[PDB]
Design an enzyme around this catalytic site. Structure first.
Site, PDB file in Angstrom:
ATOM      1  N   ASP A 107       0.861  -1.168   0.000  1.00  0.00           N
ATOM      2  CA  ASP A 107       0.000   0.000   0.000  1.00  0.00           C
ATOM      3  C   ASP A 107       0.907   1.229   0.000  1.00  0.00           C
ATOM      4  O   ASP A 107       2.069   1.159   0.402  1.00  0.00           O
ATOM      5  CB  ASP A 107      -1.012  -0.035   1.135  1.00  0.00           C
ATOM      6  CG  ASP A 107      -2.298   0.735   0.873  1.00  0.00           C
ATOM      7  OD1 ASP A 107      -2.313   1.533  -0.083  1.00  0.00           O
ATOM      8  OD2 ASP A 107      -3.287   0.495   1.597  1.00  0.00           O
TER       9      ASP A 107
HETATM   10  O1  LIG Z   1      -4.558   5.209  -4.062  1.00  0.00           O
HETATM   11  C1  LIG Z   1      -3.550   4.231  -3.790  1.00  0.00           C
HETATM   12  C2  LIG Z   1      -3.819   3.494  -2.485  1.00  0.00           C
HETATM   13  N1  LIG Z   1      -3.827   4.443  -1.364  1.00  0.00           N
HETATM   14  C3  LIG Z   1      -4.035   3.829  -0.044  1.00  0.00           C
HETATM   15  C4  LIG Z   1      -5.253   2.916  -0.006  1.00  0.00           C
HETATM   16  O2  LIG Z   1      -5.236   2.218   1.236  1.00  0.00           O
HETATM   17  C5  LIG Z   1      -5.289   1.946  -1.181  1.00  0.00           C
HETATM   18  O3  LIG Z   1      -6.522   1.220  -1.180  1.00  0.00           O
HETATM   19  C6  LIG Z   1      -5.126   2.700  -2.485  1.00  0.00           C
HETATM   20  O4  LIG Z   1      -5.091   1.789  -3.578  1.00  0.00           O
END
Ligand SMILES: OC[C@H]1NC[C@H](O)[C@@H](O)[C@@H]1O
Ligand SMILES: OC[C@H]1NC[C@H](O)[C@@H](O)[C@@H]1O
Ligand SMILES: [Mg+2]
Ligand SMILES: [Mg+2]
Ligand SMILES: [Mg+2]
Ligand SMILES: [Mg+2]
Ligand SMILES: [Mg+2]
Lengths: 781, 215, 781
Positions: free
Chosen positions: C259
């Protein structure tokens, strides 16, 4: 693209004169240090990683804690039980050296009492190129002399109190737009580099650099290099800016710290004149670069010695106490990570450092009020039958005085702008509050406060019954990381906020004795109402800090005759000022280019050049008494002819072409001592005039000395000296000052020195930039 | 101070009800003003006034730092020709106005020395907060007229010992009071009938008769 | 504190079975690469540096561009001319594998058409431990089986369309509070580490891991590791999680991406099972670690080949087209820095990829409507004399359908939650619009829409006259970086937003034929009004995407009989659900500790355990017709006995204790194939029953198979299978499914394997978790 030539090596300290004692002790300290310990002094610990807005690394082996660097120019930021002082623009409006000094002292006291080593101020950059520049109010004046003098006094006050002052921002940071790419991206701009302020050599010397020279000569311990570029080199890695202008020509002996995250070339920044990286990678790389000879040992030795010289110069060895507050919480205790598990430690001692500082704040408030108009409106008595108070700017911030973080709103009375240049109010006396106290302690007539700018029906209702209507209006601005009402730090227009102009017009249509108080960070366009016959008086009161209402009523009700003069011009239009703000990038994805094409012609210089008449000219202000000017006299002093500085520096001691050269260097013709070649401060003429109080009440006059340098490209006039003088009715005084060589010189890029041109010079003494009552030639010799 | 005709609003400090039973203020000294005057003429400690009942975050953060927290709440009513906030003269409930109860709870949760000042035209239901241990004092100050803030601080700061007694009962519920208010016609297009069936048993006589304990 | 044991080495690909062709091709490709080129695949280019939400480095020597990773689970985020699909929670309410698949395919088509390589979805974590968890709506259901099945179908759809799918977030990210330290600090908490989800081995296997096993087995190309810690080790550097559970036991063959800024121990993350770092500064560190031998060659090789294996598996080589949109601007052109000067380049081609996907979005909208109550309210005819429409949730977002950044507001009708799990609406049909269209095309009765929840007089006014009153209420939530109305991602309560409850009560007081429509991200507490006799029907419609109003009226007016079932429980109190949200740090400045003490007992399992009655049970929903269940039969299938996996891997090819060991490793007894030991999916029993439509209109029924595992600590029932079936009046069908060995097993920590316990098991077939119409023993064998 405008270009910044290289200048190496980075000059090492001389430690001559006023810096000798400090240098000697700095040397004895640094001599004992490992390379790692020296590097620690240059390295910030990380954003929000300790207690202060910035801290250096420590030297525990010698029981030396990291330095505490704390905002702001008008108080102690992020701290409780502190005072909120008037803004720098208010200090400028006093035209009062003594008050600037005493404000510095008091701020210094408060920082000292909290354990702060470096106060991050005062401000001479922005100087005030743009009337709509967001952070101008943190500084003093677009005029370099007014700013330079009061800058210097402020520094002496702070440092006399035992705290290191930090002249900022160096240099060319005249607007908030595009100051930092990440910030501009946050606003939907696609750029990868900060704007470049493109400033020619002449303009730099005669305008923006001038007050920083004063700062250096005043003994300031540190400088902060700015976020923006100057001629397409970031200030903090601009070798010409730091190594040449600051450390050679102005012979600055102290340390240069980066603005927070101000981009620089890492190890290359150190070679270009940077001494300290804030807020905190640089530590490790600096160590490695020394070990492999990319950075010579004398450079890092010099960085550490500058820092420690600043420390000893102000007596931090004597005045240092533990940092007794936390910037990031008001909680008394907090958890901290330990070698094992965690501790629960005291993080705030709530040490009350306010002392009696409310007095100087009230006083500076009163002294910074500028009477712009008075057709028999002021003073008031307090025995008026019915007093109407009008405008949100009279009333309370309904979220509490500190209810907007970093003051990032315009709720209620405006006493402080927004951003880093702030402090929390211990309390805030509003105009509504002070006016009601005044009435209810005196004649006890009627008084009503309508403090909703939309409540126009009520304002008519009340204004039509009033013996006097006191209308409050404001305009706010601040640092670029905060946007209020679509003002992205910089002001999007020169209008009164929240329909203030409508409030004025509504009240004035219903009351023929209307008084207007403006709390503005800078000028606003007043063309449509200032001349309204029903507006019998107008004051600017700026950003007065915690005692706003009280400081004001002392003036309005006649305990204090107003004596401030406006430290900037009130023009008819935005166009009057020239120098429009760049608000759209003009270099694709690269650094926008803010070309300073107007040269030295900002504020009053521009108005004078183009023959635009101001509504209220630079240096203008009224009194409750009258003054008369007579008998100007000019005495030539037959100073020694100017000698360009010459000779060599010492070899760089230990305790990109030329960047590792530690051999003796040639002194620049205009350098040779802190603040420049000492021959620049030789007194060339003594100029006198008589000021007489011809009125009926004691009052202060601010006589002003202007010079015409006489060339086709010179301003018609430039301010060169001033004083604030109390005169009893009938009393006279002889005002005597001197003009330095610098005062009557021009910068010559070819010879790289100040020159006195063959153009005939005229001296003027008067009550404003336009009211030049007296004049005489300056006879050459 | 006189911005609402016949005082037909609840803007700022409540010092007078609405309708014909009113007069214009020559001036109005607010609690905010008097408390600040008190502090700044004595110890000159810190003082901040959060006077927006919606700014709960600010209240939390100021209250956490306070030696003492002085909370102000009100409830208003008046003559039937004026309606404010759905109160057609008569009060539609015995709640504090403008989320006063939430102001109290917020401040009390952050400061263990909270003082509550009530400017009400009559009783309100206080069962939920009166016994909060963080509420160290409670006063009712009613509708004090032009000198409100000054009269109040004289008491709060000990120049005058409080000696008033409540001239009506403070009950746990609206039902405690009996005598429900007739708000819908009960005789068609003709004269509604408000039957005074309780007889002499109003206010405390009612509480006493039904052996209900007042707060 | 809870502790996560180490598990090394990081398993390398087998490329067996369904992955063999992809493995072969990935090997051929990675064989040609330098080390730097391999590391480029593993390294994100940095936040907002290129076009997609994330991109890898490129390999231009072979004409191979960096991969494009793009949000969201319900569409193409940050793009123009795309569709906005219904949220995952709506997909869950359909209980429709086919619809889940088709949504995957359509989303996949759209990503494909834009040049996206990886769609960052779908979501099985958060699963849904907390009813107030902010991101639950992005997932499916608190039930692991429901979520797992639909998760797998979605994945197959996306990947069948030629795009790599990404199962996230692995694992334990059941709330937004304290997910990331910086974000928590932004909200004024003082912590330096992400919360730790403390989950025992059995709970993991039987609840949170289960749908992720389904995703592996469905052939998902990538996994995203979560921000939070699991047993005090960050997911992205948690060797037990990634190396043991994901890559050994579940034998995942694809790549693990972090993430965005999900914290890890840099180079040690790679040893712990991380394959790709997003978004970006580890590239050169991984290169070095390989050169100095801290990271084996076989590891970086396995990282590269996993990424490429996923690439070839979905046929990126055939389907890839240039990235033809930009995430960070809608401008058609823009500047890019070059080797010298700048290039002006095309940045958006505005490629329209919506095709006919409005059809499936409408259909899924309709299929996700759950009829919770109907006492003669529905369906409507469109020939009603007077229709009142009530509530802001019926109306338009006044700032435009996309007027709130990342849908971070609750303006007008709620059709999508907030944060990263979003996409832009090409348009949004509101209920107001669709209902007016319905009336004005049919009976042309009166219709009025009061879409201000404060306008209670008008609601009474109109509701008094209405034949029917249709009330709209919502409750919103989303990702933690956004706060709306004091909801910091997670919901601060289970109340309807903006006084929805008062709207309902006001309307129901005046109209005895009141219909309530709920657009909520999850359950709210409805105890005070659901049993109101004036409320003649209640529907949940969730987050329907662009066709909201149309999909809804299709159901309300009887074109489509509602067949959705609530995929979560509607409880009487918040306490009903247990598992209260941790909103206050409980480990000082350290990682907050979130103990999953309830075990597998979330949602309906909890209600069942405590014998508490829900208002509406998991799996409950009504129809416009009635259904009858009869004649259950259980057929033992006499499966082969379960065999633990045995033998060893091959040694790690090239093209902390045990971390560098490239020697053959022993297969875990519950591993052996993607998704677990193949014996786990042997069919043990065939269970069948007759379903009949006994009413007067066609409708869908969702029959559900529940199992009682029979142990003292087992839930009374767990969902094991389901289908959605359309039946005409008087139509019968035989519903037949099989129970796998996994379906009737428990996780045994001692033996590290799934075990069928000796307790008697019972199978139930019913129309909800509580409406278990048929049952039979599962005969032991
Ligand atoms: O936007 C990128 C990413 N940011 C953080 C989020 O937790 C995740 O779901 C997402 O894909
Ligand atoms: O807050 C520290 C630092 N931030 C940035 C501002 O430009 C500077 O004036 C201030 O001192
Ligand atoms: Mg700290
Ligand atoms: Mg020197
Ligand atoms: Mg770009
Ligand atoms: Mg394997
Ligand atoms: Mg939790």
């Amino acid at each position: 693209l405008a270009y910044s030539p290289p200048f190496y090596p980075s000059p090492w300290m001389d430690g001559n004169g006023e810096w000798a004692e400090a240098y000697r002790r700095a040397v004895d300290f640094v001599s004992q240090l490992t390379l790692a310990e020296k590097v620690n002094l240059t390295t910030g610990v990380g954003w929000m990683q300790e207690k202060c807005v910035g801290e250096t690394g420590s030297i525990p082996r010698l029981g030396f804690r990291g330095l505490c660097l704390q905002d702001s120019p008008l108080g102690v930021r992020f701290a409780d039980y502190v005072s909120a002082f008037p803004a720098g623009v208010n200090v400028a409006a006093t035209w009062d050296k003594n008050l600037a000094y005493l404000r510095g002292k008091a701020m210094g006291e408060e920082h000292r009492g909290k354990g702060v080593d470096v106060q991050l101020g005062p401000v001479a950059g922005p100087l005030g190129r743009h009337p709509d520049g967001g952070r101008n109010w943190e500084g003093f004046s677009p005029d370099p002399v007014l700013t330079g003098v009061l800058m210097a006094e402020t520094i002496k006050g702070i440092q006399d109190a035992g705290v290191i002052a930090c002249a900022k921002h160096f240099i060319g940071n005249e607007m908030e737009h595009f100051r930092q790419a990440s910030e501009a991206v946050g606003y939907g701009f696609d750029i990868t580099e900060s704007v470049s302020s493109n400033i020619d050599d002449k303009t730099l010397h005669e305008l923006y650099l001038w007050p920083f020279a004063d700062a250096v000569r005043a003994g300031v311990g540190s400088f902060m290099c700015s976020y923006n570029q100057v001629n397409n080199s970031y200030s903090c890695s601009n070798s010409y800016l730091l190594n040449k202008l600051l450390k050679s020509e102005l012979d600055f002996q102290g340390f240069v710290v980066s603005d927070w995250g101000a981009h620089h070339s890492g190890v290359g920044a150190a070679l270009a004149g940077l001494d300290m990286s804030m807020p905190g990678f640089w530590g490790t790389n600096l160590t490695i670069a020394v070990l492999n000879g990319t950075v010579p040992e004398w450079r890092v030795d010099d960085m550490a010695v500058r820092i420690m010289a600043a420390f000893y110069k102000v007596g931090r060895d004597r005045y240092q106490v533990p940092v007794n507050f936390d910037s990031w919480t008001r909680d008394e205790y907090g958890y901290e990570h330990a070698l094992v598990g965690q501790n629960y430690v005291k993080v705030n001692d709530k040490v009350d450092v306010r002392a009696d500082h409310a007095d100087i704040i009230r006083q500076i408030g009163s002294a910074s009020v500028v009477l712009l108009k008075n057709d028999g409106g002021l003073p008031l008595t307090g025995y008026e039958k019915f007093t109407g108070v009008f405008g949100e700017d009279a009333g309370s911030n309904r979220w509490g005085a500190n209810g907007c973080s970093d003051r990032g709103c315009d709720n209620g009375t405006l006493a402080m702008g927004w951003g880093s240049g702030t402090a929390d109010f211990p309390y805030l006396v509003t105009p509504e509050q002070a006016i009601q106290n005044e009435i209810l302690s005196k004649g006890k007539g009627l008084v009503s406060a309508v403090t909703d700018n939309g409540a126009l029906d009520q304002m008519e209702q009340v204004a039509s019954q009033a013996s006097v209507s006191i209308v409050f209006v404001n305009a706010d601005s601040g640092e670029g990381y905060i946007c209020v009402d679509g003002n992205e730090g910089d002001r999007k227009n020169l209008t009164l906020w929240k329909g203030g102009e409508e409030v004025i017009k509504t009240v004035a249509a219903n009351c023929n004795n209307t008084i207007v108080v403006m709390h503005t960070v800078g000028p606003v366009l007043i063309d449509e109402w200032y001349d309204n016959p029903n507006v019998t008086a107008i004051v600017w009161a700026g950003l007065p800090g915690q005692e706003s209402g009280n400081s004001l009523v002392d003036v309005l009700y006649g305990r204090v005759s107003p004596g401030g003069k406006t430290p900037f011009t009130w023009g008819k239009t935005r166009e009057s000022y020239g120098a429009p703000l760049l608000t759209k990038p003009n270099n694709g994805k690269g650094a926008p280019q803010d070309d300073f094409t107007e040269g030295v012609f900002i504020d009053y210089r521009r108005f004078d050049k183009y023959n635009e008449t101001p509504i209220y000219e630079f240096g203008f202000g009224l009194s409750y008494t009258t003054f008369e000017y007579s008998d100007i006299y000019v005495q030539p002093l037959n100073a020694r002819p100017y000698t360009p500085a010459s000779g060599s520096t010492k070899a760089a001691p230990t305790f990109p072409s030329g960047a590792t050269d530690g051999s003796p260097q040639p002194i620049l013709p205009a350098g040779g001592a802190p603040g420049g070649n000492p021959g620049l401060y030789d007194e060339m003429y003594r100029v006198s005039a008589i000021i007489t109080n011809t009125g009926n009440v004691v009052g202060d006059e601010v006589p002003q000395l202007y010079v015409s340098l006489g060339g086709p490209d010179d301003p018609k006039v430039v301010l060169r000296n001033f004083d604030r003088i109390t005169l009893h009715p009938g009393q006279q005084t002889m005002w005597t000052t001197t003009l330095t060589r610098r005062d009557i010189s021009n910068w010559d890029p070819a010879s790289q020195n100040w020159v006195v041109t063959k153009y005939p010079k005229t001296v003027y003494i008067g009550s404003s930039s336009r009211k030049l009552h007296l004049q005489a030639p300056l006879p050459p010799y």
